[PDB]
């Protein structure tokens, strides 16, 4: 699981790989209100429910 701050993974003797998530989602930020809330929930799943 890659958190927001990023994940560093060392595999054997290889140089470590670094991964960061980006704002990917299956919703849309300019469509119907339910698509809106789906996008706005998928990006920030914790405090979107709080604000809603």
């Amino acid at each position: 699981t890659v958190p927001t701050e990023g994940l560093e993974v060392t595999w054997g003797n290889n140089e470590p790989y670094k991964y960061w998530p980006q704002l990917s989602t299956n919703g849309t930020a300019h469509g119907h209100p339910h698509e809106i809330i789906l996008y706005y929930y998928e990006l920030y799943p914790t405090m979107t429910v709080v604000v809603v």
């Binding site: 890659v2 990023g6 560093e8 060392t10 790989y17 670094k18 991964y19 960061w20 998530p21 980006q22 704002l23 990917s24 989602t25 849309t28 930020a29 300019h30 209100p33 809106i36 809330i37 996008y39 706005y40 990006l43 604000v51």
Partner: protein
């Protein structure tokens, strides 16, 4: 002119600042921290290594009892055993058969291998942070290496740089550390002269070549087997070897904030913690007056593409009509979006293209091209890839920023419901006013 700014400590992400000197054309400086090194100052506590049990040949008194004398040797242990009848290859050692005694002695010396295979127990106090900074100054890439304690002045191309003091004093090293080869460990080693057998630091010495040796290995001599001349002993095995087989994970694999731990000298590199104040004294020769810089009028912004992909996904095309040929520094007027280009050459009536990175659902922002501003609005789409191998170039955004047409919607909803509330308030107020007229 002295310009003071603050940049996050993250390594490899350039940040751009607007030096705005009234009476002169705006200047844009892009600075990127290529390497930040925290080198703690180490006071060596001691050196641990593998011990060696020195056992000289036992003495065998054929008819009589042998006795020994105490010695100052690091772990000297002697014992006399009675009623031994040892045998050599040719038969019994000597005539007297039951009165024979064996004097057996042993001690512990730090091995010669302590010169090369050893662990150093150090104490660390404070870090003298240093930074390598890449600055896009006057269109050229310059590199300044400066101590980040706020007290080093580096002058390049007549421009003076003061770096530091770093906001956060956090370091991955605690007070007491252990260094072995290229690995650094954070452990509370036992105090000097009070080591424990079979664990780390059972044998201790201040320096690898020091002749004094504190060793605690529980060297206890045992009775030799009947008919043999060997010297048996019960001893806790070298704690250095047990630590080596059970080291665990080093700091470079467990340090927080993604710090890279190195040795010779001990360094912590690229810790993305806190931020860095940077003060730049820029000479007058680097500035251009507003009347000599181009004047841009009748400019408009269009956004052919925008995706918040953390890799400068948005593109802006701006039409301008320049007063005369020249160069001018393009800078974003908001913190939510960042422009890759620092300056653009402009000439006549034309269009210029810039690439920007953002996290906004709708990229509504303003761009200050030369001394004027142009407003851009965009319909931005999410990227299809979930994971990338580089940190986001755009900045984190607040509550109101991401809201876009959802904000347009909550405007309608709040307006309607608050209108209902206002109508109710008006009805209540008029009813109260009428009520007070009836007394």
């Amino acid at each position: 002119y002295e310009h003071v700014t603050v940049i996050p400590n993250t390594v490899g992400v350039p940040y751009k600042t607007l030096v705005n000197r009234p009476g002169y054309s705006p200047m844009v400086l892009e600075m990127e921290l290529l390497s930040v090194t925290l080198e703690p100052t180490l006071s060596l506590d001691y050196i641990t290594c593998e011990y060696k049990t020195v056992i000289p040949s036992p003495y065998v008194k054929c008819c009589g009892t042998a006795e020994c004398k105490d010695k100052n040797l690091p772990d000297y242990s002697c014992k006399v055993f009675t009623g031994v009848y040892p045998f050599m290859w040719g038969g019994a050692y000597c005539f007297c058969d039951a009165e024979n005694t064996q004097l057996s002695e042993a001690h512990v010396e730090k091995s010669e291998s302590c010169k090369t295979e050893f662990a150093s127990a150090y104490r660390a106090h404070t870090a003298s942070a240093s930074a390598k900074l890449r600055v896009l100054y006057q269109g050229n890439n310059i590199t300044v290496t400066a101590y980040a304690n706020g007290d080093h002045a580096v002058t390049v191309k007549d421009a003076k740089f003061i770096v530091g003091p770093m906001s956060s004093a956090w370091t991955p090293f605690d007070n007491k550390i252990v260094v072995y080869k290229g690995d650094v460990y954070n452990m509370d080693y036992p105090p000097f002269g009070a080591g424990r057998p079979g664990q780390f630091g059972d044998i201790q010495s201040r320096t690898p070549e020091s002749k004094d040796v504190y060793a605690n290995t529980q060297l206890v001599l045992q009775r030799p087997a009947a008919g043999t001349v060997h010297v048996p002993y019960s001893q806790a095995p070298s704690g250095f070897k047990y630590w080596l087989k059970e080291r665990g994970a080093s700091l470079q694999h467990t340090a927080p904030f993604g710090c890279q731990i190195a040795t010779n000298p001990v360094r912590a590199v690229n810790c993305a913690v806190g931020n860095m104040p940077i003060s730049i004294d820029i000479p007058e020769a680097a500035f251009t007056r507003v009347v000599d810089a181009p004047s841009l009028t009748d400019m408009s912004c269009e956004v052919p593409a925008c995706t918040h992909s953390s890799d400068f996904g948005g593109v802006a095309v701006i039409k301008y009509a320049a007063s005369k040929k020249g160069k001018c520094a393009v800078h974003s007027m908001t913190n939510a979006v960042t422009i890759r280009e620092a300056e653009i050459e402009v000439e006549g009536n034309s269009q210029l293209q810039i690439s920007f990175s953002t996290a906004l659902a709708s990229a509504e922002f303003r761009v200050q091209v030369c001394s004027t501003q142009v407003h851009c609005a965009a319909e931005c789409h999410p990227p299809k890839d979930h994971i990338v191998n580089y940190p986001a170039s755009h900045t984190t955004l607040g509550v109101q920023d991401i809201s876009a047409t959802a904000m347009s919607w909550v405007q309608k909803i709040t307006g309607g419901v608050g209108l209902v509330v206002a109508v109710a308030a008006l009805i209540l107020i008029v009813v109260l006013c009428v009520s007070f007229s009836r007394h």
